[PDB]
Design a protein around this ligand. Sequence first.
Ligand SMILES: Nc1ncnc2c1ncn2[C@@H]1O[C@H](COP(=O)(O)OP(=O)(O)O)[C@@H](O)[C@H]1O
Ligand SMILES: Nc1ncnc2c1ncn2[C@@H]1O[C@H](COP(=O)(O)OP(=O)(O)O)[C@@H](O)[C@H]1O
Ligand SMILES: [Mg+2]
Ligand SMILES: [Mg+2]
Ligand SMILES: [Zn+2]
Ligand SMILES: [Zn+2]
Lengths: 48, 84, 97, 595, 137, 689
Amino acid sequence: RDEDRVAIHEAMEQQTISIAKAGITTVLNSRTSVLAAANPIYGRYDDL
Amino acid sequence: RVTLQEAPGTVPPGRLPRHREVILLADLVDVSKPGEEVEVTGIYKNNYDGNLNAKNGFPVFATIIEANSIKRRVFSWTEEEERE
Amino acid sequence: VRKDPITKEWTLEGGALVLADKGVCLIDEFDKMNDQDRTSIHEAMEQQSISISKAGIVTTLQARCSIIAAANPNGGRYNSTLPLAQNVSLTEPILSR
Amino acid sequence: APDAVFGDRVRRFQEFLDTFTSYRDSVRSIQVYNSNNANILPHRIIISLDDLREFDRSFWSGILVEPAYFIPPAEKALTDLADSMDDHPWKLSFKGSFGAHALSPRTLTAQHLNKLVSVEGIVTKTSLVRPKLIRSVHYAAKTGRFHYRDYTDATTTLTTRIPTPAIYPTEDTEGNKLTTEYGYSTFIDHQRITVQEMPEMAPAGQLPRSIDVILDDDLVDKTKPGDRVNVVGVFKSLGAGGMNQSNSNTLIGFKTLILGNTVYPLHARSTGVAARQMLTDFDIRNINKLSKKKDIFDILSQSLAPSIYGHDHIKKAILLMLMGGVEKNLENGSHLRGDINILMVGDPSTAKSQLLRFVLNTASLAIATTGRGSSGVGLTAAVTTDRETGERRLEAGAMVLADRGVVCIDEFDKMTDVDRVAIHEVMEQQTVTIAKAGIHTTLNARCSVIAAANPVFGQYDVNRDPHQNIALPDSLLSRFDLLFVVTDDINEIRDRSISEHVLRTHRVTIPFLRKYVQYAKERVIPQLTQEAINVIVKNYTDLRNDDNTKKSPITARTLETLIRLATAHAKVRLSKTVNKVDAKVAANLLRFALL
Amino acid sequence: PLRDLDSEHVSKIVRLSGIIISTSVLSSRATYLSIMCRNCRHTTSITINTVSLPRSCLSTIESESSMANESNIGDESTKKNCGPDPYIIIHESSKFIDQQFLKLQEIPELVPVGEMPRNLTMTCDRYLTNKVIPGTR
Amino acid sequence: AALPSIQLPVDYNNLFNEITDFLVTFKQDKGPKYMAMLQKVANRELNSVIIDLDDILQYQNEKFLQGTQADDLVSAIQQNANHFTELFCRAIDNNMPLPTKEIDYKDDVLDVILNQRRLRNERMLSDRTNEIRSENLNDALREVVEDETELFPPNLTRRYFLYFKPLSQNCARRYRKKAISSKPLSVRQIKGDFLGQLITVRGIITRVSDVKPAVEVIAYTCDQCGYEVFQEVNSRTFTPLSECTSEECSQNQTKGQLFMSTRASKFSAFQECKIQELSQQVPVGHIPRSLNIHVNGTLVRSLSPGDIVDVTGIFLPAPYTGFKALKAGLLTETYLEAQFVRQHKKKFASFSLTSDVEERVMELITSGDVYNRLAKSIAPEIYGNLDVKKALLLLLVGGVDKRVGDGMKIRGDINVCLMGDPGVAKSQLLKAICKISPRGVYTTGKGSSGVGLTAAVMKDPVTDEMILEGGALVLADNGICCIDEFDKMDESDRTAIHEVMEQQTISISKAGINTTLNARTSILAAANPLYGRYNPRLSPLDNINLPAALLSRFDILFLMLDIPSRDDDEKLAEHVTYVHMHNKQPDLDFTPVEPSKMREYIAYAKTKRPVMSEAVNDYVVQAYIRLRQDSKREMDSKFSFGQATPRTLLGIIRLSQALAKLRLADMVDIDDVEEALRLVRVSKESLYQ
Ligand SMILES: Nc1ncnc2c1ncn2[C@@H]1O[C@H](COP(=O)(O)OP(=O)(O)O)[C@@H](O)[C@H]1O
Ligand SMILES: Nc1ncnc2c1ncn2[C@@H]1O[C@H](COP(=O)(O)OP(=O)(O)O)[C@@H](O)[C@H]1O
Ligand SMILES: [Mg+2]
Ligand SMILES: [Mg+2]
Ligand SMILES: [Zn+2]
Ligand SMILES: [Zn+2]
C-alpha cells in the first residue's frame, strides 16, 4: 500500500517513524536493515 | 452441563426444535463432544432449588435431566491388522 | 483474539491453517478470497507458520499442512487459447507454490 | 502531646536551613513580592537532595526512605523560620539526584511503598478541578452568634490518624436553627490525574502500565493530557485491603497512589510542550554583542545544518520562518496573518528530509507529519470523545497542538483534497471550525508550515512548464509564501567538492541559536517605515507587471509576504524598526525563489 | 494436558504446558501489619508468611498487667466495649509484597474442531512476578 | 465545647435598618423610586424587583459627604449575596402600600389565592382577640394573640421576585471604588475562592433547557381537621408526607391522611444553561471549558443557544455526583444562579423608539448620504469593492415579506453569492458580515457536514425527554448564514441549502425522525472557479462546478476577477501597507460608523413596509420585458451564467423594497428600481472586459 511505502521510505533513511493522531504524537526508533526480493512483471526478465 | 437439541430431521414441518439441559457426573464428562447425536438415560426432575418464589409473575418452574448413561446414537490398529 | 460468549474470556484462535497442523486444509471456491485470506494463505504456504501481533500478544504458530483447493476460471469457462496464468484471478507467487 | 524525636528533627532541619542561605532569601523574596503586589504567590520552596546529602546523610536517608517521619518536621521548621522573619503553612519540593528511587510506572513495585519516588511518563487523562469543604460557618438568628466546624480526611496527612467523622451542623447546642454562610466558609481545589509509560520507552507489542497521582491546592492544573511529565511524591497505601469485616473476597489488594508534591513538564520531539531555556547575563551580553555585526545574517544562516552542502537560500528562509513576523488585530475584530510558510520541490536525493528533520529537532515546538500518515480527524482535531460525567469534548490534533509553533510535512504531494481544503483555513484564517452533533466551536491554529514535494515525472524537467512539473492547485500554491526548486546536475567540480565534504563529515552551536531565537521572538516587535513602504510598493508593482514566467502566481499575498519577510529580517536584526536593507533582502529572496 | 486435569488431582502437584495469553497488573498484599485500637489505643501486630483483622479488641482476654485490669473500667457502672472492628492499620510501619495473575490455555494447534480452547487462571507472587510475557510457551 | 463560636465584623440589625432607610429614602436624579415600584407591584402590574447597587453606592456617598455615619452595604452584599435576598424581601414586605385597584374577574388566580389568604389571616387574628377579650381573666393583648395563633407565613403571600444587578465600572470609577461584581471572567478563572459571591461571567451560550416547574413548597390538606400543611423542598428529590402533623391531629389519637393539592403549592420556573469560553480567552494549546447557570423566576427564556453574553449570578456549591471510589473528602460541584443578563449585540425584534436612540438616529439621517455612508462602513479595511458592499448592506436590510392568502407565501430575504479568483478577500467579507449580524453564523466546507447542518436527535440531561439540536442552518434562523468554500461541499449539504433558499424549511425523513424544520435565514456563499483562476476561453457555465439552476437561485451573483493593472495595484498596495503600518484606514474626509449604530439604524428600518404604486409597476414590467428579451440572445451564444427568469423580477422587486426601507419611506419611487437594475447590471462587468 501507499501508506506503507511512505512509512518505510521514512524508515530506511531517518530510521524513525513519526506518528500523528488525534490523541497521540511521537517519533519512534526503528534502527533496522532492509533486504528485499522482487519478481519482474510479465513473469520473466526481458533484456529488450 | 450439556445442552441437547432435537435432531432437525425428526421435527414435523412448521415447528421449531426444542432443547433441554443435562447433568453429567463422574466419568460421564468429556464423552460426547459437540456436534454428535446421542442417547441419554436419566432422571427428569425440576430445578427444585430455583432461585426463590418472591419473583413476580406466574409460579412456573424450570426442569433438567440428570444423566445416568450416555451412548453414541477410528485410526488405530493391531497385530491382526498389521499382518493384513 | 476474540471473546468467548459463555465463559466471557479472551481467547487466541488460529485459522484453519494453524488448526490443521500436520493435516490437510481444504478450501472451496479458491478464486473468491479477499485480501486478508490471500495474505494468510501466502504466508502459510511460503513459511509454514503464521504470525500475529494483537491485544498484547506477539507469537508465531506452526502451519505445516497440506492444501487442496478448487477454483473457477474467469467468466466461468476455460479459454484454452491462453496460458493458465491468464485464465484465473490468482497471481504467480501463489500459483507457483 | 509533644514528641522528643519530632523536636530533635525540627532542630536539625533548622540547623540545615541555617547553614545554607539560598532558601532563606527565597522565602523572604516571596513574602516581599506578595506584600508589595497587594496576584498572590503560593507559599512553597524547593530543596536540593544533593546539599542535604553533603550535610547530613542520616537525615537524607530518612527523607528518602521514611518521608512520613522526617518531612513534617522539615515543613514545621520552614514554617517557623517564615513566621519569625516576616514583619498558611509552608510546603516543600525536592530536586536533585534520587539515585535508585527514580523509576517508571512499570518498575514501581510493592517494595517502594511509603518511600519518596520520582516517576516519568505521559499524562493520559486529568479530572475536573473540584472544591473541597474544609471549614463551614453558620449563623443563629435567635441569638446573633456565628459558629464553625473543621473537616479532615485520610489524604491530608502523611501519618495515620484516628478518624473523627464530624457531621454537618444544622442546629445549635440549644436547638435553634442555623444558616449557612457560603462566603465565610473555606474551600480548597482538588484534582486527580493518571500517568502512563512513555510511548518512546515502553516495550513494543505489550500493554502499558500506569499510576494515579493526587494533587491539591496550588498544583491543581499544571499539566494537560498528552504531556511528558515528571512527578515526585510519596507512594502510599490506604484503607484495608478487605481485611476489616469478613470480606471473603481475596482478589483485590491495597489501594495505592502517589500524594504528589512536585510536577515538572518535560519537552520532547513532536510533542505539545515547548522548550524554554533560562537566559543568564553572559548569554545576553554575547547575544547583544553579536547583534552589532554586519554579517550576522550570514553567520546565523551558515550555522544551520552545517552537514549539508549549499542550499544557502533555503537556510536563510528557514531562519526567517523560525523568527517570524508580526500579526495585527484591528479594533473592528479583523485579523492579519504574521506567519511564514515554505515549500520545497526537488530531486529525490537533494537532502529535503534531512533539513526537515533538522527543523523538527531545533524548533522549540514542532510536530512531524507525513503525507498519508495522518488524515481526517487526525489533523484538525475533528474527533469527539466524552467524559464519564456524560459531556462530549474535543481533543487536539496535529495542527491544533502546534499552535504558535511549526509543522513539518513530508511527502506533501501524497495528500488528498479532503485535508487540503481543511489546511486552507489553517494556512490563511489560522482557525479550525467544527460543527458536529452537540458541538459548535472554533479553535486557534496559528502555526507555520514547511513541506517537501516530489516532481510528477520522478525528476524535474526543464523542457516543460512548471505547471506540468508541480501539479498542485493554484489556490494552494498561493498560500505558500516561498517555493523553492532544487535540481542536481552532474558537474565534475561540484561532485568533487561535495565528495570531499561528505568524506570530511564521515570522519555558532545549536544551543546559542535557540537562545538567540527565543530572545529575539520574545523581546522585539518592529514597526513599518516609509522607506520600506516605498521599496516594497515598487517591487510589488514591478513583479505584478512583468512578462517573466514564474514558479508561482502573484496576488496581494505576495505583498503581504514581502512585508512579513522584511519584518522577520528586522526581528533578526534586533532593531525596533524596518529599514531599507530588510526590504531589499526580502525582495531579493522573493525574486530568487520566483526566478 | 490442560484437558486432562480433573478431581483426582485436587491439592496435588502437577506439571503443565501451554501458551501465556494474558498477564495482569501487580497487586499489593500484606506480609506484616501494625494495628491499633481507635478507642483505647491498644496496639499489636500480625505476620503473614484468609487472615483478617480481629473482630474484637484484644485488651481484655490479654491480661497484660494488674493496672491493665483497672484501666479496662472507669466512670462508674458503665462497661467498656470498644465496638465491632475497632482496629485500624498504621501503614507507615507495615510491609507489603507483589502479586500477579496469569492466563494459560492449550496450544491452538491441537484444539478439537468446532470448540473453542480451554484456559485456566494462575497466581504467582514475589520472585515469580514479571517473568514472562503473553505469547510465550 | 463542641461547635465553638466565632466573632465577625458583621451586624445584621444595622444592615436591616440601613436597608429600610435606603428603600424609603433614595432619590433618582416624584416620590421614592422603590416606593413607586412597590405601589405598582401592589396594584398587580409588576412581577419582579431589580435592585441596582449603583443606587446603594450613591446613597452611601450622599450620607458620607454630609458628615453622618453609614455602613458598607455594597461590599456586604457582594461577598455574601445569598443572605441579603431574604433581608430585602422582609424589608419590602413591611412597606408595601395597600392596593388602589379592586380585584375583579380579570385577575390572575395566584392573586385571588393570595388575597383570600390575607383576609383569612385577618379574620383569625380578630377572632382570637375577641375570644381573649371576652374571657375576663393593649400591647400585651396583641402579643398573646400573636403567640397562640397560626397564620400564613410571608413567603406564601408574596407575589414578586427580587434580583440584584452589579456595580457598573462607570460608577465605581467616578466614586473611586473597585467594582468586583462586574469584572468579566472566563470559566477558567472562577475558582473555589469565589464561592458565595456575586460575580459576572463572559461567554457564549451553547445549550438551553425547556422551562419546567420546580416545586419550592408542597401543599397538603386534611379532611379531618381542615388545616393546610406546607413542606419545604430544597433538594433534587424529596419524600412526600403521609399523616397529618397539625396541632389538632397531633394532640388527638386518630390522625388524618394528607392529600396533595397542586394549586396551593409553590412552584418556580426553572432553566439550566451551559456557557463556554471564547476563543480569545483560551490559553495556547488548550481546549475551552464550560460552566453551569441556573435561571429562576421571570428571568427565564432570556438566553438562547449561540449568544455571547455577560451573565451575573451568585456562585454557589452543590453536592458531589461523581464516582464513589474517587471521592476524597467533602467534594462539591458548582453552579451559577442568574440575576441579570446583557447581550453583546441587540436583537432587532426587541427594538423600541426612545429619546436616546431617536437622537442618534436623527443625527444619522441629518448627516445625509445614508446609503453610501452605510455601504462604505462594511469592512473598511478592504480597498475597493463598493457595489459588493452595497449588495451586502441590502442583504442585511432585506425586503418585504408578503402573505398572499390561501396559505401562499413569498419570501422577503435576499441571497447573495460571491465567486472570484484567489486572493480577493472574499473570506474577510464573509467574516465581517457574520460579525455585524446579531444572529450570524460562519461555516467552511467539509468541517460542517451532515447533522452539523440541520439537526440531530439527543437526550436532555436535565429533563427526561428527547429533543432536536439545531445545526448551523437552525442556529442562524432570522439571521445570516455564511458558507465558505461553497463549491467543495457534498451533495446532501447542497440539497439542504437548495431547499432552505427555496422555502425556508428543511424536511428530514430518516430513522427515528419525520419532521419539518424552520429555516428563515439568508445565505451568503463564496466559491472559486473550477481551474483556479477564471479561463476566458471557456463558457461561463464551464468555469464553475455548481449546477446552473442553483446559481439561478440567487438574487445577486457576483464575478470578481483579478486582471493585473499597474495603476489600481498601486492604490491597493498603498491601502494595505498603510493598514499594516497603523491600525486604521487611510481616508480622512470620511468617518466610519461603528457596528452598534448600524445595528440600531437597521433595526429601525426593518419596521417599515413600503408598497408598490402604478407607475413603478409599469416601469418594472417594461424593464422586465426588455431584459428578458435581451438575455435569450446572450444565452444562445453560450455566454450567460443563466437566462433571465421570473426570479430575476422577484429579486428586482425585493431590492427595490429594501432600498425604500433603507430610505425610511412608506412608498417606493422610480430611483429605487433604477438602483436595483443598476446593481444587477454591475453584477457582471468582469465577464465583458
Ligand atoms: N547537499 C547535500 N549535502 C550533504 N549530503 C547530502 C546532500 N544531498 C543529499 N545528501 C545525502 O543523501 C541523502 C539524501 O537523503 P534524503 O534527505 O531522504 O534526500 P531526499 O529526501 O531528497 O530523497 C542524505 O542521507 C544525505 O546525507
Ligand atoms: N482588496 C483587498 N484589500 C486589502 N487586503 C486584501 C485585498 N484582497 C486580498 N487581501 C488580503 O489577502 C488575503 C486574502 O485571503 P482571503 O481573505 O482568504 O481571501 P480569498 O479567500 O479570496 O483569497 C487576506 O488576508 C487579505 O488581507
Ligand atoms: Mg525525503
Ligand atoms: Mg478564502
Ligand atoms: Zn480497644
Ligand atoms: Zn389533620
